[PDB]
Design a protein around this nucleic acid. Structure first.
Ligand SMILES: [K+]
Ligand SMILES: [Mg+2]
Ligand SMILES: [Mg+2]
Ligand code: NA
Lengths: 260, 95, 198, 103, 153
RNA sequence: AUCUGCGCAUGGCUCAUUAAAUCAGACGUAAUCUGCCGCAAAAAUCUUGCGGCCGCAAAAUUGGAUAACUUGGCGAAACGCCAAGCUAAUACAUGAACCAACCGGGUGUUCUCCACGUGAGACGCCCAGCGAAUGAAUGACAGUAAAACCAAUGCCUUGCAGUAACACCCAGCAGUGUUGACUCAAUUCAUUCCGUGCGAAAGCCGGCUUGUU
């Protein structure tokens, strides 16, 4: 039972400077994994800049001023990972946690009737006592009666306010997916093929809007729409399009020159 | 006896101090439940039975959906079979 | 204390392992129950995680199942008659899994009479098969027309004691459940028991 | 609604293994019946001469006790003329199938 | 009148304790044809994954093996390795050799090495020394056995 | 102050041990345990107060402790100790009928029919919660076409077109868990669980509007 988390051992996506401290806020168990989460203290202090330090972050959080999935969280070690809707009603923040093309966490601003919607990737299906079909998603939710067509890998559209499923998107070829882990994290493409290896990891090959083919393990894909144009969730600024590094460097240099 | 106020008969001890004012100390009556506590206790059971009934209703909804889907498939299959059979019997009639 | 680690074992090459750590609680063992035939006596053991294992030191009754009839009855254990590990476990009347015992056949005889209307004792508190209503008589013939019993089992029921095999671990569960020997399993063990008497 | 105008009537429960056709008939006495069908689901279908008589039977026989059972009566949407037409259609098919067997 | 029970197979019953499969009851009077081979007996035989065919001897045999991947609770998982039979002197156990070449970086050259493995061989197979076998990883069956023979080539 | 709950198995330190060890990358655990934390679920349970087991009623008005404290203390001391008097808990123990469902298995020398029993229907009483144990059964199929006959049974009508299943009260209230694989998930039936399980903490705090819902 480990309670601490060194800053060097902390995930790089948290963007915590190595000289500021020795420790980082260890994520408490919960919805998302320790390596694939962004703690509420980090979100409220190092991202939103609302709190200048951990003390003010605690004063903000312990009042229940920050809502994650329509429920106030008083813990600064709450995981608060991917697809999570974080709303501050006092400031009316309402942003969703997504991945950008660089793989870092991004705060995509939402609106009403969009902050009520959350997508969940079904990671398991099992029958509970009373012969009740239960679907377990990527954030730890257990849906008590999902769509009869739900299968492992498909995504469900969840209404966080009403706590009910509103739609199901199957994991089929041609669907639009976002890569959730690995080297292609944050990229958005369409499934062109899924090589199935019984006993081993399946490999999904995807092609983005520009036509660049890239592969990844099938456990790292997350269906977000029926097509690369009709997405069921808003994505970050880059629209999941990885840019060539040389072209990006020249564009940044040109923009910096044009600023002055 | 029952239905009698207990707070009136509680032991009150007298504290006398130089100057100030005489102090009367009485214990906080534990296990004395007011009508508010009774309302809370009844509300607990009401909520439990409501939750169980709601779960039963959800089970009924799911079962009805499953059975309706099976019914629709069954009668589509039987309508197709009836069309095939009627085409077969048309040829049978009058050789 | 007792351990279940492979540190004390010699390597496949014959070498001696040089242990560089102290013993752990996650690799412990515990002394066996050595369950005997007697009036029920058990002791709880706090296993890992907070759960409990009922170490049974003595047991006298248990749930024995007629599998071909898909039924079970709680009967007394009369004897232990064969152990594959050694005959010392038969002399000491030790109840372990897969050991052969003799149990009370009266509940099984009574259930047979109540279910199929056949009284084994008659042809050679007790249920009366002539008292049954004639709706139950129609029930008995429907059941009787599919099912036939084995003579080896029927002979044991008439004698009053029937051989059985323990299917539960008494030192872990704390109970001695079992199954009645039927088919080739009964004929296998009966032959071993005849060798001892001659 | 397809039941108000119809002259067919559904009556439940009637347990065929415990009731005879004449025993159902004494309940259905007073109104002429073209035919009476009893089914395994413990219910019977009757077809009366007129929709007025069929309607008048329902409210007067709904809730009454028959053979010790509270009895429910409703207007049925099926029609005897439709049944007769379907049987007339099926008879020639039966004959054709019989001939096909010996062919 | 009386049910005629099956006889005891003297060629299989040699272990001083009755040898039986724990997944099925051979003493049922009216089996359900789910676990019934072509000979009419009651046999439990499951289909392991990864596209491995259940041997005909596993399906319609008489042997009893508590550690066979096809007729017991032993499951195949993890690595699927390939080797050559080296020794067949144990009972229901074989030694296989995995011969490979190891690249020594400094000299830019390879060297031949081998790795002996203790593998449990089900009675559904009869491998000889020098035969080529496929093995699948299972749970520890003894202090050295962690693999089960899945196919003889 | 002292009960109660939680932590103290982390952090810090050192590198003595240690070569089928440790460790690294890569894999398993379908061979397992897991407090905290996330999302869920929960219809077992005859209790209480009054009068004479019964009757009648019901916002269940549960019971013993025991610290701190006090009194008398012991000991050279001791992160040492007696003994007696108080007094609480979300400590400990106990215990909640009805409300309040669905669904099954076993039966009665039980009645009502129907035929002269695979009959039907009431009614009685014995069990039917989660988790656990043993035993049976599920946990699919997927390498062939036509008639007969008999018994029963549905229909059609008074011979088989046509026909999800099902002898009412539910005419679709699961014929369909999952995996690469399961003796697994879950379900049903039989018998069992003896503390070594299972309260609505018989708990606490707020609002208001201030409510035997
Ligand atoms: K304490
Ligand atoms: Mg001895
Ligand atoms: Mg440490
Ligand atoms: Na012996």
């Amino acid at each position: 039972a480990k309670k601490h988390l060194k800053r060097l051992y902390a995930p790089k996506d948290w963007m915590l400077s190595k000289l500021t401290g020795v420790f980082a806020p260890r994520p408490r168990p919960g919805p998302h994994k320790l390596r694939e989460c962004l703690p509420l203290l980090v979100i409220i202090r190092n991202r939103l800049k609302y709190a200048l330090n951990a003390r003010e972050g605690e004063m903000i959080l312990r009042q229940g001023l920050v809502h994650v999935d329509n429920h106030p969280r008083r813990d600064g070690k709450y995981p608060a990972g991917f697809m999570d809707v974080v709303e501050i009603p006092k400031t009316g923040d309402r942003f969703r946690l997504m991945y950008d093309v660089k793989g870092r966490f991004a705060l995509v601003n939402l609106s009403e009737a969009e902050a009520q919607i959350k997508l969940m990737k079904v990671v398991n299906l099992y029958t509970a006592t009373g012969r009740v079909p239960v679907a377990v998603t990527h954030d730890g939710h257990r849906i008590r009666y999902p769509d009869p067509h739900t299968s492992i890998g498909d995504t469900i559209v969840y209404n966080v306010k009403e706590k009910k499923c509103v739609d199901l998107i199957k994991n089929r070829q041609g669907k639009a997916v976002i890569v959730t882990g690995g080297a292609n994290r944050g990229r958005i493409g369409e499934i062109v093929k899924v090589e199935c290896h019984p006993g081993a990891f399946n490999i999904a090959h995807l092609k983005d809007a520009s036509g660049a083919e890239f592969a990844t393990r099938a456990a790292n894909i997350f269906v977000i729409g029926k097509d690369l144009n009709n997405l069921q969730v808003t994505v970050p600024k880059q629209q999941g399009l990885r840019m060539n590094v040389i072209q990006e460097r020249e564009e940044r240099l040109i923009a910096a020159e044009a600023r002055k | 006896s029952r239905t009698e106020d207990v707070r009136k008969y509680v032991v009150r001890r007298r504290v006398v101090k130089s100057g100030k004012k005489d102090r009367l100390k009485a214990p906080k009556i534990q296990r004395l439940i007011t009508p508010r506590v009774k309302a809370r206790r009844a509300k607990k059971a009401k909520d439990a039975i409501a939750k169980v009934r709601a779960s039963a209703a959800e089970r009924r909804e799911y079962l009805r959906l499953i059975a309706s889907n099976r019914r629709a498939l069954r009668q589509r299959d039987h309508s197709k079979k009836h069309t095939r059979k009627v085409h077969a019997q048309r040829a049978e009639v009058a050789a | 204390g007792i351990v279940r680690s492979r540190l004390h074992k010699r390597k496949i090459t014959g070498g001696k392992t040089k242990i560089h750590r102290k013993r752990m609680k996650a690799e412990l063992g515990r002394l066996p129950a050595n369950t005997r035939l007697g009036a029920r006596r058990v002791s709880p053991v706090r296993a890992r995680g907070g759960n409990f294992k009922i170490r049974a030191l003595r047991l006298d009754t248990g749930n024995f199942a007629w599998a071909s009839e898909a039924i079970a009855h709680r009967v007394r254990l009369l004897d232990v008659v064969y152990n594959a590990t050694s005959n010392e476990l038969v002399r000491t009347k030790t109840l372990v899994k897969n050991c052969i015992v003799a149990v009370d056949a009266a509940p099984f005889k009574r259930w047979y009479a109540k279910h199929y209307g056949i009284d084994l004792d008659a042809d050679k508190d007790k249920y009366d098969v002539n008292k049954a209503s004639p709706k139950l008589q129609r029930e008995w013939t429907r059941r009787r027309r599919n099912h036939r019993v084995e003579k080896a089992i029927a002979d044991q029921l008439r004698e009053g004691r029937v051989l059985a095999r323990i299917t539960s671990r008494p030192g872990q569960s704390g109970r001695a459940d079992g199954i009645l020997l039927e088919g080739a399993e009964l004929q296998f063990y009966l032959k071993r028991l005849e060798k001892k008497k001659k | 609604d397809a039941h108000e105008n119809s002259s067919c009537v559904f009556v439940s429960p009637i347990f065929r293994p415990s009731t005879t056709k004449a025993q159902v008939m004494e309940l259905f006495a007073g109104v002429k019946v073209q035919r009476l069908r009893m089914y395994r689901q413990n219910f019977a279908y009757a077809y009366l001469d007129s929709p007025a008589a069929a309607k008048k039977f329902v409210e007067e026989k709904n809730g009454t006790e028959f053979r010790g059972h509270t009895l429910r009566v409703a207007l049925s949407a099926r029609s005897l003329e439709k049944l007769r037409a379907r049987q007339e259609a099926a008879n020639v098919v039966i004959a054709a199938h019989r001939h096909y067997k010996t062919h | 009148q009386y049910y005629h029970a099956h006889a005891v197979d003297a060629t299989i019953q040699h272990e001083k304790a009755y040898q039986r499969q724990t997944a099925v009851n051979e003493n049922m009077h009216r089996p359900s044809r789910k676990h019934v081979n072509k000979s009419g007996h009651i046999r439990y035989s499951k289909k392991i994954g990864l596209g491995f065919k259940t041997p005909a001897k596993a399906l319609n045999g008489k042997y009893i093996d508590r550690k066979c991947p096809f007729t017991s609770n032993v499951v195949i998982r993890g690595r699927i390795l390939r080797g050559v039979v080296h020794s067949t002197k144990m009972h229901r156990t074989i030694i296989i050799r995995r011969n490979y070449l190891h690249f020594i970086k400094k000299y830019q050259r390879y060297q031949k090495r081998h790795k002996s493995l203790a593998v449990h061989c089900s009675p559904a197979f009869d491998p000889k020394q020098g035969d080529e076998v496929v093995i699948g990883q299972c749970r520890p069956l003894s202090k050295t056995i962690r693999y089960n023979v899945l196919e003889v080539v």
